[PDB]
């Protein structure tokens, strides 16, 4: 109960998830590029 919020685990999670969601948004947008 009443754990820390920010930890090494928090940083490890975000270091991956944050650019992952950014990249996924980029690729989603690419799905609509027309030649």
């Amino acid at each position: 109960v009443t754990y820390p919020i920010f930890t090494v685990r928090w940083l490890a999670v975000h270091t991956l998830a944050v650019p992952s969601v950014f990249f996924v948004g980029a690729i989603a947008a690419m799905q609509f590029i027309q030649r």
Partner: protein
Amino acid sequence: MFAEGRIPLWVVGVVAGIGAIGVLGLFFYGAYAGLGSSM
């Protein structure tokens, strides 16, 4: 919902799974439209 103050984990799983399925469906759709579709 069934309990107050928290979301059931199965509801979160269903929502995240549907989001992931939609993302993969968009990618497969894009395989047939726009760039890389051979048309």
